[PDB]
Amino acid sequence: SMEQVAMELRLTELTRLLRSVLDQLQDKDPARIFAQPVSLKEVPDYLDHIKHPMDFATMRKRLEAQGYKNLHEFEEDFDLIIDNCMKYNARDTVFYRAAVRLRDQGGVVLRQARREVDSIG
Numbered sequence: 001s002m003e004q005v006a007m008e009l010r011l012t013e014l015t016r017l018l019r020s021v022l023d024q025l026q027d028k029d030p031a032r033i034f035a036q037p038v039s040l041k042e043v044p045d046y047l048d049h050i051k052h053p054m055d056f057a058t059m060r061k062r063l064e065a066q067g068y069k070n071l072h073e074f075e076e077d078f079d080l081i082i083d084n085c086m087k088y089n090a091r092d093t094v095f096y097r098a099a100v101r102l103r104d105q106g107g108v109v110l111r112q113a114r115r116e117v118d119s120i121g
Contacts, residue, residue, distance in 0.1 A: 014117070015066050018074050021113045022063060025078060026056050028105040033098045034081050049088055054080035071117045075110060082106075 029035070037055045038046045046053065059077050068074045085099040 010121075011066050011069070013120070014068070014070070015063060017113070017116060017120075018063055018068055018071070021074070021109060022056070022059060024109045025102070025106050028102050028109075029056070029098065031094075031098060033095060034085070034102065046088075050084045052080055053084060056081070071114060078106065078110070 026035070034056050036057050038050075038053055040046055054077050059074070059081075062068060062077070063074075082099045082103045085095055089095040089099075
């Protein structure tokens with residue numbers, strides 16, 4: 001149907017926007033602390049601590065399969081990256097501090113993305 005196609009064009013355009021949002025968010029992590037999943041070889045207990053791990057590569061795979069239906073879903077995943085790190089790592093660590101910075105700097109980017117997704121519909 002033409003109705004199906006038009007929804008698919010909307011999903012594709014949301015996907016393009018979210019890829020530009022993702023690149024911008026990831027520039028706020030120059031140290032690449034959140035680039036990849038936590039290794040279960042190097043933190044074997046990780047899953048006793050954190051129930052839903054998240055990282056930028058995993059967000060990127062989901063994105064290329066057009067697996068984000070809206071901005072809310074994308075934001076949930078971004079927030080997991082941050083929130084997981086702040087629980088697992090103590091306040092005085094390079095990891096916790098990098099999450100605080102990503103959050104503060106990410107908030108600006110997401111403030112305008114929310115306006116662009118409403119705006120372009």
